[model samples]
Target: YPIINFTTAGATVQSYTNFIRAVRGRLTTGADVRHEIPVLPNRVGLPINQRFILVELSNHAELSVTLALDVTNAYVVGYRAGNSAYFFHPDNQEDAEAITHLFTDVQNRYTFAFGGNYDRLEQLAGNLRENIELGNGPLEEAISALYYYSTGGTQLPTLARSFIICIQMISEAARFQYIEGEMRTRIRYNRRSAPDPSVITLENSWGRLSTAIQESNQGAFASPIQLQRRNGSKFSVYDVSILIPIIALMVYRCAPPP
Candidate 1:
């Protein structure tokens, strides 16, 4: 099996158990999914990092998280050693690594954007996963964007495509109030090429974010940019690629239920 290492710091065993349950809950109708903490023969002999939670899938069952396919005969693992949340797949190492990187990027972004308030960040992600379970359409688009963004190449094109999807989805959902009130109006009039029905004035923080994205995508290189949220936390980025999916998560978390 191809192994990918990651961290799960600041998460309790109870939280991890819930996460496993959440994954099981997202399986399609006929999926036979079971996960467990494997018993190691020599815990003292091996490094602590070898401890992990293993999830198995059988009977052509599929997970609906990204609308990709039924991951038949596969496993999802989270490394319980140290703070890493290492997730992996045996057959496809690239996809597995992509997922691990996505998780890492999100954790870093959350720390920067929310000043290390991982509790709310975790809750927000959990809420989005629940929405995906309920088959929220626009949020599914957001999740698809995330999957595509994870597989995308380079910073500019990645941010370019992902940002458009996130912006449009957030506009349709109209859930900016959870992030900032001014976003309700400021998200418009600047990001798109042609005029849109959602045109409105730009607020400072969201304006900077969209402005940076627009400039970078349009051949104006934005080497370093810093966006300060209304809560006084600053999210600084040299490349805007990673910011797109976090916006996707926000839309799903704050959106009204289906």
Candidate 2:
């Protein structure tokens, strides 16, 4: 049987609740505050950082928000850990609700991008164990397959691509808002000496983010989507989930009820 390490990939809401209360001291005194920072994963491994962090969300929240995106995306965790909300948002409705669990490889690791409640996060953590080795590498090349599980066969064709890009920029803006929130919570209110160090990377790396949005816009052809699918385009890099009755156009398109 696998020993459950509550801190590592198997974090939960029980984890989150305890975590919030645990770090509550960051609210009163900066001294000895247990820091739980979200790492925007470099995909290249430690000490290195991704120029941009990809933000994702579920069907309901994505379409309702200014990003106006459609969900029905992802795999691995073969769809484990499932969908996430945009990492950052100011309005109560837009703010991401996740099981920001604290996990570890017996080392520094944590992710707010877990799930809504505790058991879900714990279940997701177990997914990391559902594995196979192809003998090429410990981190072996795994297969990634796509199914047109939605109306849009892919964000192909310039028109669809442009809308998606616009969605991307707005999500980035939402992330920016959330990052600011962290500053208020983790530092100002929590009274911590500083917010997570990752914020620095986000600030410095936004140059790349701006370029990504700009390039996507320019490259996309004139989309028939004239009215604009989003509130407006607000771009950023590291900002970065979902719920019900969140019915909408994109979901209808992406996950047509089987």
Candidate 3:
């Protein structure tokens, strides 16, 4: 996801909120409504440095605000991994710590790019159990087979390949259902509040996400097969030999001046 920063030189709080609403409306699906601005108390009778604005509706909300002073100018002291201890801007120190925590948490949970850990037998077993528990039956086994073969590099018999292809098609349909469920959970339209415009905007986002997932799966299928074939090929020796010199030359050329 791309980060969006808005410059509000002379904009009022309401104006900033409107800008946020407009951006959200343009970029997502959902209505913008009730919001809350947090009132933080002063520290040591001095004015607080940070202001927070929370935009909350029935279904969705976003938080936005600004620091009273330039964060870049604040005093900061910290230690970084493999680096000597240092003192910098206080705001930078805070932001650095916050960002590290954020990334750590995100990496732990979300699948950022193409693939993730589809390999572990325990994880696959869990998925299989869930499918069986859900009454998905033998189709669940087929799903497990695909994930297992793709991740575990298990050899696929002709019959298994046919089964996997069929299961892949079913998986595509399941993906749509998953998307619908996600939309239902993430977007809401109640009696008082109408459907979120952000939810509607997410259609495009989900479409792109779906495409990426499909491509990743396709790549996973092709990569191992190609790798296996290449491993067995006589040309493998020649290719490795040719690759070495080409890589060496490229590295030499790209190397920094001595």
Candidate 4:
């Protein structure tokens, strides 16, 4: 039996489910195996505000396994922002459509290279389509396709070169229309607020906090000699806070004519 947990924050439940299902389909090949996926609701008591799908497999063979998938804040936020930009931009829409076609070609090419069996590839394609329809497909196939082209997988060098060309074309077609320089300047300007000089002092305070001496007669300096000793102790407190009391006692014993 194998158990898997797919947990993510700020992403649609369907998306995580799909990705997990795709992985399961690729990995699971055994016969007469039973699998259960339980969708648990987010509750107030949970430490992380995340969504998760728990998968469990049970069998007579006494096999057991567990897997956990977690979505970090960065991934969730980045995906949301990217989706928003893609949704609003007309150019993004056009590019996405073109990228879809390119992805299909890449998948086909890889499938052909792996086995040169069109029927088997077609079957896989059909399975993919069904999986997608059933909300059980990973959405990162296009990105994976791009990666495969750049990395040169099982394909011949010539074929890899061809894949690269296709990838370049598709990438160019999908390029965002926004001017990078202007966008960067705007982002920078928005981030630039007046610097708070107090921050430096606050930082210094933090540095000093751990080193400040806690003494019984810290405010009892009376004469110039006493003041000098107090001031020296204050400066030394930064480094000698751990031994201040011992040092003070030793100084008191060694004090001359006072």
By lDDT, rank the candidates, best first. Answer: 1, 3, 4, 2
lDDT of 1 at 141: 33
Q: Is candidate 3 or candidate 4 better by TM-score?
A: 3
Give lDDT tens digits, candidate 1, residues 1-258: 222211122223343334333332332122211111111122233222222223221111111121111122112222211122323232345434334433343232211122112133224344321122111233233333333333342243332332233332222122122222222223331121211212221112343443444445432336665555444456566554555432211100111112
Which parts of model 4 have CA positions greater than 4 angstroms off?
1-10, 13-128, 131-137, 154-258
Better of 1 and 2 by TM-score: 1
Error of 4 at 163 (Å): 14
Sorted on TM-score, best first, the list reads: 1, 2, 3, 4
Sequence-dependent TM-score of model 2: 0.18
The per-residue C-alpha lDDT of model 2 at residue 238 equals 22
Tens digit of lDDT per residue, candidate 3, span 1-258?
A: 112233323323343344334323322212211111111122222222221111111101121211111111111111111111111223334443432322122212221121111122224233321122111222223334333342344343421332322222121112223322322232232111111322222222333332222333322222211111212332211122222211100100111112
lDDT of 3: 0.23
Clashing pairs in 1: 6-84, 6-85, 7-83, 7-84, 7-85, 8-83, 8-84
* Candidate topping TM-score: 1
Assess candidate 4 and give its TM-score to the true structure. Answer: 0.14
State how far residue 229 of model 1 sits from its true place (Å).
26
The better candidate by lDDT, 1 or 4, is 1
Q: Which lDDT values do the candidates have, in the order given?
A: 0.28, 0.22, 0.23, 0.23
**Residue-pair clashes, model 2:** 18
Off by over 4 Å in 2: 1-175, 217-258
TM-score of each: 0.20, 0.18, 0.15, 0.14
